[PDB]
Subunit: 280 residues, 6 copies
Amino acid sequence: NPFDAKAWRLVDGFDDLTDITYHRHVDDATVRVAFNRPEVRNAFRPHTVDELYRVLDHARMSPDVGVVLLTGNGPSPKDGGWAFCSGGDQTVDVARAGRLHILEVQRLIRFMPKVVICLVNGWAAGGGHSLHVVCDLTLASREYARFKQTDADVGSFDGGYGSAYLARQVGQKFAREIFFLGRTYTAEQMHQMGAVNAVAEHAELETVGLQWAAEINAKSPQAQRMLKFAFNLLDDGLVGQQLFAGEATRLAYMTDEAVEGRDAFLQKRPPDWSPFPRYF
Amino acid sequence: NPFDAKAWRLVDGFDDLTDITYHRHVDDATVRVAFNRPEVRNAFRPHTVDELYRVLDHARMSPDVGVVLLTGNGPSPKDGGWAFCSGGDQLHILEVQRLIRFMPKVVICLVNGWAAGGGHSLHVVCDLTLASREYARFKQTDADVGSFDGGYGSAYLARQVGQKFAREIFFLGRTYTAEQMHQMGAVNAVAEHAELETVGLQWAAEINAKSPQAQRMLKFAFNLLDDGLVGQQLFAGEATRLAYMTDEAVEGRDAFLQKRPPDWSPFPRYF
Amino acid sequence: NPFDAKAWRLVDGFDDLTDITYHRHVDDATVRVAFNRPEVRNAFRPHTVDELYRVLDHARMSPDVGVVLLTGNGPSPKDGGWAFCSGGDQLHILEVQRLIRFMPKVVICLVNGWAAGGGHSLHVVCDLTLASREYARFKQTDADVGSFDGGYGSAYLARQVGQKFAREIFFLGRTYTAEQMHQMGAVNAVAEHAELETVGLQWAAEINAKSPQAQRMLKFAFNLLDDGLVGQQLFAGEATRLAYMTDEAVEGRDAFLQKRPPDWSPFPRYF
Amino acid sequence: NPFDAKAWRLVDGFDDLTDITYHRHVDDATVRVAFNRPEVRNAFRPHTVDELYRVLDHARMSPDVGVVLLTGNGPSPKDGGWAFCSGGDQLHILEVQRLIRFMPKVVICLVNGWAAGGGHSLHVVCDLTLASREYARFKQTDADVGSFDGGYGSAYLARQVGQKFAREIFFLGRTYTAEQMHQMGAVNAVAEHAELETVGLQWAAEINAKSPQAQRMLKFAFNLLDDGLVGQQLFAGEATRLAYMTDEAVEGRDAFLQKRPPDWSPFPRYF
Amino acid sequence: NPFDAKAWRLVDGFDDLTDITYHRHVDDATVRVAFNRPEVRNAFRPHTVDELYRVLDHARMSPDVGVVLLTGNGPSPKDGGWAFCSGGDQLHILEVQRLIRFMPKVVICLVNGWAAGGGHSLHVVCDLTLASREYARFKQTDADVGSFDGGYGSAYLARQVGQKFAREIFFLGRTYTAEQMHQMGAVNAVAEHAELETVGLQWAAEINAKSPQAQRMLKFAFNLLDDGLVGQQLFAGEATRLAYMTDEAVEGRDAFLQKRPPDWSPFPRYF
Amino acid sequence: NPFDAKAWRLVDGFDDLTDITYHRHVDDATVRVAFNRPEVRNAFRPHTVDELYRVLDHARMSPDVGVVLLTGNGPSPKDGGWAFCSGGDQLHILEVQRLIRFMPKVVICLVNGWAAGGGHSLHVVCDLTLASREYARFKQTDADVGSFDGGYGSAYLARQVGQKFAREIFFLGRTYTAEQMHQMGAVNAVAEHAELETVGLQWAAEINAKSPQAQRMLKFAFNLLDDGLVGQQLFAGEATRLAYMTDEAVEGRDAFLQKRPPDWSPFPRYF
Ligand SMILES: CC(=O)CC(=O)SCCNC(=O)CCNC(=O)[C@H](O)C(C)(C)COP(=O)(O)OP(=O)(O)OC[C@H]1O[C@@H](n2cnc3c(N)ncnc32)[C@H](O)[C@@H]1OP(=O)(O)O
Ligand SMILES: CC(=O)CC(=O)SCCNC(=O)CCNC(=O)[C@H](O)C(C)(C)COP(=O)(O)OP(=O)(O)OC[C@H]1O[C@@H](n2cnc3c(N)ncnc32)[C@H](O)[C@@H]1OP(=O)(O)O
Ligand SMILES: CC(=O)CC(=O)SCCNC(=O)CCNC(=O)[C@H](O)C(C)(C)COP(=O)(O)OP(=O)(O)OC[C@H]1O[C@@H](n2cnc3c(N)ncnc32)[C@H](O)[C@@H]1OP(=O)(O)O
Ligand SMILES: CC(=O)CC(=O)SCCNC(=O)CCNC(=O)[C@H](O)C(C)(C)COP(=O)(O)OP(=O)(O)OC[C@H]1O[C@@H](n2cnc3c(N)ncnc32)[C@H](O)[C@@H]1OP(=O)(O)O
Ligand SMILES: CC(=O)CC(=O)SCCNC(=O)CCNC(=O)[C@H](O)C(C)(C)COP(=O)(O)OP(=O)(O)OC[C@H]1O[C@@H](n2cnc3c(N)ncnc32)[C@H](O)[C@@H]1OP(=O)(O)O
Ligand SMILES: CC(=O)CC(=O)SCCNC(=O)CCNC(=O)[C@H](O)C(C)(C)COP(=O)(O)OP(=O)(O)OC[C@H]1O[C@@H](n2cnc3c(N)ncnc32)[C@H](O)[C@@H]1OP(=O)(O)O
């Protein structure tokens, strides 16, 4: 079992969680967010997404958290099988019911100024596959990671990050193959294609996760933030620019030049820009 | 005063609002969301942003609301001056920008006074803008104080007025009238100050009289390329929803639960 | 020989074909489209392009065809050498590229031999590529002769193998095997020469066993952003088709013919 | 009536046209392509699109034609009303849009009356638009009936009038005059109704007086980035053709046929 | 005459200039760079481009210069005619385009006369354009002579005036006035001929009165997406510079030199 | 030692170089440009960037040079360790990045040792990379010291190795071998350390054996979309050059000088 209880502490205020677990590391700036429905191959129902959102949002807003490990608990108490996430659990009520609340989760992972590593501990199918795709990094169980894009089998499709963004990891030929055929791939296979960063022994998956997390946390958090947004930038168009530029704005705010401008507004005087040069 | 009290009721559950007001129209699928700090030219402080987010987010999830009217209350009790919003009280706001940008409803900015700094950037990111002829004033002051909106406020502005005018708006930081902004392409239409919300409601009614499904697809179709993968994600998400409703997708869902092979023969290969 | 005659039937109406062959599978929703000039390493002359266009266009419009297998016949009767296609016989081809790119079905290139110049570019633009272990040979010779595919052949290759490999492939013009191209990212899988079309058929069957609607949307989703407005046009066009089938769109269409106002109340504002 | 019969001759081979008319000018390298169902406000049915496609394709491949004038015949024999095209008779059309977009000739839309739905979208995708002052009426009705052009009709319109105006045009579905659309940026110029085709022909004459090669390159240069890989394919295709004509390309071609190594010494490395 | 000699002093080190003049304002952080061949309508020959490059580069690297005013001297001593620049004397210019595009300062083109061919394209690539009411004439003649600017001259012009107007400007090659280009969106404002440089200086002064850091970021924010990886490279480069000045970045630099591990505890994870 | 002295001669005019060396090959159209501070792991100080820029610029303008081999001299006389480049000595480098990116010749990085920080990023932006099996070490250390290359170093690396591997390279800052970077897609090929430049020269020779015109066009085709309007500028610039050489463009040029109307009748409208 990848989960090492000794390493994790419950996060305050999340006692009511049923479909998701949420831990903070005993020492490191890292959290563990996991699907907690192993009986159903960790499929998400609307309540799961609600909880996932809440938890990830909380982790986004925690200034002492640098890295999110996104995984699935297991194994299944019914048949011993391992799953990361098998996707969606298969008049005012109607709009609130049919949701794409998962697309919001995808955006949350994409936009949060911290690194999200998906630890694929088992089946990653449909929406669960797409969650892995959108995470920044992926580490996968050698013995048990299974990647299967089953959307088209049931008449569904992720026409967004699940597919188009996958192509920016494995290239257009591989990505089209993954969706068009819906075959099952191992960790090593996906690693060879370029969607999985590294493969780890099943029982060491979270240990390797934590080691990756610690290497990320050992660097300047400002740089890591800028970096994530630089990687996102052009692919995400104006949104990519908005988030990168937003960090540039924050950096500028801290400078002497920007204090001068702020001062002179409050003091009703003209600003003096003579101390600060025109860099080229 | 643009505000017609008879047309609006408060939305239940928002009694604690201090910096923002939130009304639903008496008949129409339209809400009114307004800056409520006219003494400070409707500048937003962090608490203002929190409320604006919650309010817009509630509007987003309200299935019986089709259109958001985003405006500012006034005038100033202190000097009679009018403001839509003067920007930050001197990153939560980027979240608000994205909320407006991604919400599957049309957001109309009603610029009833000054729109400056972040307040200006809020108008730019809205789908449509109507502006008070007498009182709307557009001023991009960011560079004055050493700040800049390097996102929707600037780059997206350029996709409305073109690259020359947008550079000018930000580089010089001049004040512009409703009619000028209308010529440049950032203001849809200009209205008599007192009629601004009347015109807003009329525009809202025309938007709400159309297929809601169509309107949502269209918004996302306009966002799509500009917003890259996020734009694709949102438009494709709506396509996925449409596909779920079809007989073909029922068959695929059936056959999975029934453990049998799916039959695709009834459904043709459209070209 | 990869070709299994028992598996294929000629398609009606194409008796006049000289440079290209065209078969429909005995059972499956799949066609076989093959260069038929093995004596000249399956190079295309203008008349080949004409036929290739007609044939691919026919396949595009055949509602009971889900997958196109694109390959080359052989071996050469003169020297026993194998070729998928060696390029132009030494702009109509750009049109064929676009047909392959825009058609709402999966095109698998089966590289059974040399794939050089334009023939290499044809492989690149297909959705998928399966290549003969023993005989697939990839060579971008364009620059040797003072020519260049500055479109899908090069820039799109880069979106398969990455910018360093794709530059390498064109700047040096070296010959690569199936396995090398598979390592690089341009070849989906390698198959024993004699089993190339058997594998192709198995791939085609797995593709055809899924929702045709989903496959169509997926293809256009993969093309979308890379193809800009054209990508959006094709994907959105499929969304439009999906919308037309809904109850909401029927109401809009009814109310127009019946001269009445439409009622949108049964249909919610999804978010 | 904008139509001057003395200016135009029928094109050989199109006697069977029912829903479209097709003329070549008596002296100029200009054709006239027109919707010919004035009784239904020039709505296109599936047969209309077939004809429109064939006709436009023929013009594309006519080497002595430089400019296409796309318009509508009228007025209505039933009520005297004028129409360019009112859209679908209440996806072949997406092919026509691509034909207009990709053809290496300038297509000028002459909006002589109503331009609604798909008919509005056809105007948008043409390179240029001239509009009848008295009679051009622009109405984007799609969302009224639960439909939407999520491609060139909307996203490309935004690249003419900007994102604010474009959203307005679709969200509200109002009717706009020639001069309003001119102000917004989607109409190049307004003409007196009766002079519409005369102005059309003068614009065409100015276009045809320039280097055809340059006009080609320019159209694809304007298309390029908007159309992503497809845009690049077409612009680079023209660059390939230009390269083929050079002495350097001749040397490369010679040396392959002559089985010798090529000599690149005469041709310098430009920078 | 727009030129006020009292306002300007020569820049040290440029006494060998023949085709270009280069002045620094007596008080303001503004330079005047001007074509100096009014006898040939300020056409640039390869020696002009050399000088223009050197001069613009010097202004780029001058830390006390905030704004470049680019213009043409006149009138012609032969015929009294005025010109900004008539293009190439009948690829070094593409380098100048990029120098203007990438320089972290605002370049204002003051079009005091004819701006044709390459001269038109220089105006298009500048950040802002102010134009002589009586004498600015914009004419894109390239296709007349079988040439074309397929880069910033055309594609980027479409990002100011929209795709319909930009296509018109190139395809017909008509002559436009200052006020027409102003209505289209390619000219920021129109000035009395005699006051063109005075208005230029006032605009410069308003630009120079704002945070230089902010203006730099803004320019690159406007260029960013349009310029793809180059746009990102420049904006990101400024972000890198900003980061270098922070306490966090000092800690990282210290710990490397001191061979110790860095401590990031003081600096929070902003969101 | 990869360096074979007998193969290289110094370039005239560069005897003042301290931090960089610059050789022309004795026979081939290939230059060797090399960091020359092995004692500090070939880190670049501002004077190094100055020289690197001048040298690369000179190679760009050398008509008789087709390929630039960019590398690092060694080993360290202090410790025997090998380096390509260790980054900045602990924005002029962004200029060098652009010079490599825009130059109309293939730049091959020969990573003969450590390639860290800025030095890693130089290797990323080169067209091709060959790496020493035993000594190439790739390590993106930026975030360790609170820095980042948010441009080509990172976003362009993702278009070589894909988004997962690129994020990993930067977020963890681990050290990779030649073979690992080869598997990822950032290194074209791996060579025996002592054979590194020999293989470089052989790659160079294959590049220089093709049509330089075609190589130029290909490099810009690969850059194009990624570099937005800059990529279009450069590609289009080459297309303009090609057009200038044609008969059609001579005709347009003639008729302007001769004051006559041009005749376009000999030149057809290709499609
Ligand atoms: C909004 C969205 O984002 C949409 C989506 O992703 S929809 C879901 C993804 N697509 C699918 O339909 C595939 C669903 N999952 C599977 O294909 C397979 O379960 C799998 C390949 C992941 C693993 O299969 P397996 O190892 O053979 O185990 P399997 O027997 O199928 O599953 C074990 C149990 O969990 C359940 N289960 C697995 N995935 C489920 C899902 N997505 N929803 C509901 N239940 C699911 C099964 O019903 C099965 O339950 P029973 O004990 O009642 O028989
Ligand atoms: C996170 C972000 O998004 C960042 C931002 O936008 S920062 C803010 C935008 N940029 C600025 O600094 C400009 C601020 N606003 C202004 O320039 C001007 O107030 C205006 C042009 C909008 C209108 O000015 P005006 O009609 O002359 O009235 P003015 O006297 O300036 O304002 C009236 C009062 O409201 C206040 N006010 C106006 N804007 C304010 C703001 N952004 N923050 C705080 N107080 C503000 C003033 O202090 C003034 O208060 P007093 O009664 O104490 O004197
Ligand atoms: C519009 C476009 O799209 C443009 C293009 O691609 S142009 C073509 C591609 N570029 C070229 O010029 C390369 C052409 N092909 C080749 O380089 C080589 O034939 C090859 C590497 C593919 C295989 O070479 P090979 O195994 O040694 O066989 P090879 O002797 O060259 O070819 C066998 C015969 O077929 C012919 N052939 C091969 N390719 C041909 C082509 N593109 N056009 C015409 N004939 C061709 C040869 O003339 C040779 O014929 P002969 O019996 O008369 O001698
Ligand atoms: C594939 C696609 O691309 C989809 C589409 O565009 S669908 C069509 C566009 N959207 C619509 O439904 C709007 C249709 N057109 C109209 O709104 C209006 O006709 C108009 C605004 C263009 C002009 O209206 P008008 O001047 O008042 O004339 P109007 O009475 O409506 O039309 C005259 C006749 O032509 C017909 N007509 C007009 N547009 C038609 C259309 N799109 N399809 C079929 N018939 C049409 C009408 O039925 C009317 O016929 P009758 O003599 O039998 O009454
Ligand atoms: C690398 C690139 O970037 C390419 C380019 O732009 S190429 C140049 C642009 N395209 C052209 O060929 C147009 C050239 N210019 C013109 O069309 C016209 O001169 C104009 C519309 C700008 C003004 O015309 P005008 O007011 O009637 O004056 P005009 O008589 O034409 O010019 C006055 C003199 O300057 C010269 N001149 C004007 N433009 C010139 C140019 N581009 N190159 C050389 N000489 C030029 C003329 O030869 C004429 O000289 P003469 O005294 O010997 O007769
Ligand atoms: C503008 C920009 O573009 C910004 C940048 O890239 S900043 C620089 C890149 N990032 C860094 O700080 C990393 C610097 N380099 C390193 O991490 C390591 O030197 C290395 C991994 C490349 C190799 O390390 P190594 O094999 O263990 O040798 P190492 O002991 O570190 O270096 C040997 C000597 O060269 C020096 N050196 C190595 N890189 C240097 C650099 N970037 N700046 C200055 N000196 C450097 C060291 O100080 C050391 O010197 P001493 O003899 O005085 O001790």
